[PDB]
Design a protein around this ligand. Structure first.
Ligand code: YU6
Ligand code: ZN
Length: 345
């Protein structure tokens, strides 16, 4: 444990907890968008994923940045792995999405261009302007007033068994048990637009809250005084460590490809590595956060960070992130641990 780390966590808790109208402004915009979308022939079956919450945030230090998902149920889906990528698929199949068919394969580009057209129109009809940024996921980014920012992703939902590329993924059997792994694999999966082309990426982002809210080997982890663990605290600190380094070097482009997602992935790989709750004692926050920082550094150096669900998908391959960018971050983190983590004060 370290006192500095707890002070950072106390600051992050107060920004998250204090009175804010922001969620209300976002709910207003989202509820309005959903109504204009449910009238469209193609987006009629659109539903907000997790209709009840605090809307989900991409940043632990930014209370004004929101992350939202609109899902479309896609029964009787045929998936085809593109170029042996393990995570990117062609979507094959009347139905409402038959309009976006280009032969047999579903067009994401055309679906996103339509989704954008409808949102861009609703923006004019409280001031909400669509941020100029263009990319498949998030499909849309809105700036509400001056401070509030909302990412909106359009995703396809499938209730069929997870694709074969996931068979060895979610290696939680020595931590959460074989019984829990089997229960989670019965949950749906998502397909989001992203190029490896008219390819969709497999997404399991919805599995995170399931694990975070029931994260111990003991069924009573964090339910009493005797069983207080630091797993959630280590993830918040790992995320905050990346966010602060990204902010510091925003004028350069060396940390542009790194995201909270990479930090989450490496963190859950440490959970598999250290499955016992005794390896996560609240008193050992310092050493636990150190095990996290060390593992992430090893990922950067070896250029290896497997998708937690798709083991043959390396998020740190040279083709996705060049070595110079990795070596830059490796140098910045190594500086932070050798200087009592200055980004935290
Ligand atoms: C044990 C475990 C479980 C889950 C994950 C996981 C996996 C994925 C994945 O893609 O498989 C993730 N992706 C991202 C970033 N996304 C940005 C866009 N958001 C849209 C949204 C917004 C609101 C409501 C739904 C959706 C969701 C969060 N964190 C992810 C985390 C990991 Cl690592 C380990
Ligand atoms: Zn716990």
């Amino acid at each position: 444990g370290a006192s500095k780390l707890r002070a950072v966590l106390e600051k992050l808790k107060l920004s998250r907890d204090d009175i804010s109208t922001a969620a209300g402004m976002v709910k207003g915009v989202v509820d309005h968008l959903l109504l204009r979308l449910k009238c469209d022939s193609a987006f009629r079956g659109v539903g907000l994923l997790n209709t009840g919450s605090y809307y989900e945030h991409v940043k632990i230090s930014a209370p004004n940045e929101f992350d939202v998902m609109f899902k479309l149920e896609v029964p009787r889906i045929q998936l085809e792995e593109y170029s042996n990528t393990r995570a990117y698929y062609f979507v094959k199949f009347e139905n409402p999405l038959s309009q976006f068919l280009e032969g047999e394969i579903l067009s994401a580009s055309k679906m996103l261009s339509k989704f954008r057209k409808i949102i861009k129109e609703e923006i004019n009809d409280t001031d909400v302007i669509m941020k100029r940024k263009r990319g498949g996921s998030p499909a849309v980014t809105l700036l509400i007033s001056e401070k509030i920012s909302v990412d909106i992703t359009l995703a396809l939902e499938s209730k069929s068994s997870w694709p074969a590329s996931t068979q060895e993924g979610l290696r939680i059997q020595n931590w959460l048990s074989a019984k829990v792994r089997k229960q989670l694999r019965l949950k749906p999966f998502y397909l989001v637009p992203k190029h490896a082309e008219e390819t969709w990426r497999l997404s399991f982002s919805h599995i995170e809250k399931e694990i975070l809210n029931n994260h111990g080997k003991s069924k009573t982890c964090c339910e009493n005084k005797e069983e207080k663990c630091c797993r959630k605290d280590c993830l918040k600190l790992m995320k905050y460590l990346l966010e602060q380094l990204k902010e510091r070097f925003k004028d350069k482009k060396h940390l542009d490809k790194f995201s909270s997602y990479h930090v989450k992935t490496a963190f859950f790989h440490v959970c598999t590595q250290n499955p016992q709750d005794s390896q996560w004692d609240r008193k050992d926050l310092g050493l636990c956060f150190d095990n996290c920082v060390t593992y992430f550094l090893q990922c950067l150096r070896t250029e290896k960070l497997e998708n937690y669900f798709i083991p043959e998908f390396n998020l740190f391959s040279s083709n996705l992130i060049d070595k110079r960018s990795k070596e830059f971050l490796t140098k910045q983190i190594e500086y932070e641990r050798n200087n009592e983590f200055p980004v935290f004060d």
